[PDB]
């Protein structure tokens, strides 16, 4: 009955080609976070990497300056009576 979706997804620091994001972990045993990012403006297409459940921050880099990005995060978590499953994503927009 507890949400497995991270909260307060935010860009914390930014250079013209990189983003540092942080989130608040969900009250749930998280094994890893999936981070996706791609260009808001139609097909780019969307790229994906994971981050250990320990962490609640990630660096996205190798981006184009002055571009709209959509960033989303969901969790690979453990819970009773679902075992290992995936959460809904939380999502934000940031323009480089």
Partner 1 sequence: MIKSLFAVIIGGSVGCTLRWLLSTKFNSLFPNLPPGTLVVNLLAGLIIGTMLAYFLRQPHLDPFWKLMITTGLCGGLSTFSTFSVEVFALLQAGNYIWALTSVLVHVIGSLIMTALGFFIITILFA
Ligand X SMILES: CCCCCCCCCCO[C@@H]1O[C@H](CO)[C@@H](O[C@H]2O[C@H](CO)[C@@H](O)[C@H](O)[C@H]2O)[C@H](O)[C@H]1O
Chain residues in the site for ligand X (CB under 6 A)? 31-32, 50-52, 54, 76
Q: Least distance from C-beta 50 to partner 1, angstroms?
A: 12
Q: In this structure, are residues 26 and 74 in contact, taking their beta carbons and an 8 Å threshold?
A: no
> Of these partners, partner 1, ligand X, none, which one is at the site of residue 40 (CB under 5 to 8 Å by kind)?
none
Of 91, 59, 86, which Cα lies nearest the Cα of 75? 86
Query: Looking at the DSSP assignment, which residues form a beta bridge with residue 13?
Result: 20
Q: Least distance from C-beta 43 to partner 1, angstroms?
A: 26
* Choice between 38 and 53, CB closer to ligand X: 53
* Choice between 16 and 49, CB closer to partner 1: 49
* Choice between 58 and 71, CB closer to ligand X: 58
Which residue in this structure is represented by tokens 């497995």? 4
Q: Rounded distance, CA 60 to CA 37, Å?
A: 8
């Amino acid at each position: 009955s507890v949400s497995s979706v991270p909260t307060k997804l935010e860009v914390v620091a930014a250079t013209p080609t990189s983003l540092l994001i942080s989130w608040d972990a969900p009250a749930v045993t998280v094994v890893h976070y999936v981070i996706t990012y791609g260009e808001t403006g139609g097909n780019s297409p969307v790229q994906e990497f994971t981050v250990p459940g320990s962490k609640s921050t990630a660096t996205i880099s190798g981006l184009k300056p002055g571009v709209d990005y959509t960033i989303t995060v969901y969790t690979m978590y453990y819970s009773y009576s679902d075992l290992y499953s995936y959460s809904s994503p939380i999502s934000i927009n940031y323009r480089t």
